[PDB]
């Protein structure tokens with residue numbers, strides 16, 4: 001379960017320094033080059049160690065780590081390609097998407113999160129830019145800011161942040177941290193836009209969220225079923241002990257999806 005790769009396995013293209021790369025043997029991939037600079041092999045013991053723990057993450061709704069590049073002067077993570085881009089990009093394209101496709105995207109996000117909390121991984125940065133979409137509108141979850149991987153992150157969006165982490169950085173994130181973020185993602189999916197569009201200042205704004213202000217449920221111009229609006233209000237309750245587990249979300253939403261939108 002060692003997956004090292006050489007820089008010269010790959011013909012690049014431009015899109016951290018994310019790059020569209022053809023591996024000469026296995027094909028089209030995405031390459032996050034996290035560092036091009038002086039050899040600094042002081043850390044490789046650790047960067048290979050983090051890469052080991054993310055190779056452990058294999059699920060149809062998570063982005064797969066297909067290989068790493070550790071070479072003197074260039075360090076890269078290589079991910080699978082996702083044709084259509086991130087979730088916001090899709091939601092904002094002109095040909096908008098039926099309620100029932102939005103239904104599945106939600107269920108698939110629910111699935112991927114239940115897998116990650118099963119592995120003890122707290123995502124810590126769930127938001128539409130980390131949700132990637134292929135040609136058939138299937139999503140995979142990614143952690144592009146490297147929020148679970150301190151070593152890679154060091155080398156290298158308050159909208160979705162649970163409030164107990166707003167103006168408190170030392171609080172350890174919990175599963176309920178991500179459930180709040182899922183709540184605002186539900187909102188963005190039906191609003192087809194980022195929340196808090198009309199906000200004065202991010203210091204003003206943070207104080208508003210802590211005091212229980214949320215994104216505008218009226219601002220949802222598409223139809224959004226009642227029970228999904230109630231779900232998102234339930235998932236963004238100020239008290240983390242009052243939000244459900246992702247296992248608990250699924251046990252409510254999968255029946256609702258099967259019997260109302262699929």
Ligand SMILES: CC(C)(C)C(=O)N1CCC[C@H]1c1cccc(F)c1
Pocket residue numbers: 054055057062063064065077079116121122123141142143144146148
């Ligand atoms: C871009 C990388 C490779 C870091 C990426 O998104 N990874 C790698 C393995 C699985 C996946 C992932 C998804 C969600 C949360 C998380 F912490 C990690």
